[PDB]
Design a protein around this ligand. Structure first.
Ligand code: V50
Ligand code: NA
Ligand code: ZN
Length: 257
């Protein structure tokens, strides 16, 4: 099965998932000089006031925090988006070293980690139908740099020891994802894909320009997770990022400056 190692990592995925070599793959390098300012884009509307977190899960490839998306609670709209996208979950990708870990890059700069807030287009009724559609998902991407602690991240960090291994979950209620947002909602946007198998080309990417700051100690706790299941040889969950893929004809649009 797929993973991040030499044997089953990103350069192998195309054999099971040929769309890996498709025309709208993610992530990409954001060339800030060739991104076009688009004065017709709207400010992002992030309405997370009624978000209902439920659970945190080690999937074997990352960890994710899941939300109750059975009603229009937390939603993303505006920006490049037509209609309303409902928050389903967030997760992170990160490095073995502070110098790497993000999936998107900015002028080839890698960040220590990248947060993905995943939302589905409510015109498609649920997530499983939305992922079959070319405008099914909107993923809000936020870079993490190592510096000051992010207080809003600590509740996540502190629960990771209870989900060390693949398939472990824990109750994770009353978590407010607004605590993970930077001050500015200036962004880049482009059409792309899931960054893990099945690599479906169903994502409108919205990548915030301003990274959030996390402490070295917070990210080191991400690196103590395990890709393996309990009772199996320990493989640290690090470097679970896909590298930049070819932009091909696509244009990246900037909301700013
Ligand atoms: C592959 C898969 C299967 C299922 C059932 N949910 C998901 S949710 C999800 C996910 F885990 C991800 F890593 C991504 S990502 N990196 O943001 O493209 C995603 F969009 C998602 F929508 N992903
Ligand atoms: Na409900
Ligand atoms: Zn992701």
């Amino acid at each position: 099965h797929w993973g991040y190692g030499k044997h089953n990592g990103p350069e192998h995925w195309h054999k099971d998932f040929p769309i890996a070599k498709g025309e709208r793959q993610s992530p990409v390098d954001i060339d800030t000089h060739t991104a076009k300012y688009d004065p017709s884009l709207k400010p992002l509307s992030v309405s997370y006031d009624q978000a209902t977190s439920l659970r945190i899960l080690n999937t074997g490839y990352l960890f994710q925090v899941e939300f109750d998306d059975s009603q229009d609670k937390a939603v993303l709209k505006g920006g490049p988006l037509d209609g309303t996208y409902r928050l389903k979950q967030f997760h992170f990708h990160w490095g073995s070293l502070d110098g790497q870990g993000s999936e998107h890059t900015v002028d080839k700069k890698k960040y220590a980690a990248e947060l993905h807030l995943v939302h589905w287009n409510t015109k498609y009724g649920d997530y499983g139908k939305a992922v079959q559609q070319p405008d099914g998902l909107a993923v809000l991407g936020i870079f993490l740099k190592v510096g000051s602690a992010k207080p809003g991240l600590q509740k996540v960090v502190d629960v990771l020891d209870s989900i060390k291994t693949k398939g472990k979950s824990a109750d994770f209620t009353n978590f407010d994802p607004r605590g993970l947002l930077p001050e500015s909602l200036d962004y880049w946007t482009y059409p792309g894909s899931l960054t893990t198998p099945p690599l479906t080309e169903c994502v409108t990417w919205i990548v915030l320009k301003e990274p959030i700051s996390v402490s070295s100690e917070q990210v080191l706790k991400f690196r103590k997770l395990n890709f393996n299941g309990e009772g199996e040889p320990e493989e640290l969950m690090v470097d679970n990022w896909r590298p930049a893929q070819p932009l091909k004809n696509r244009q990246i649009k900037a909301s700013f400056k």
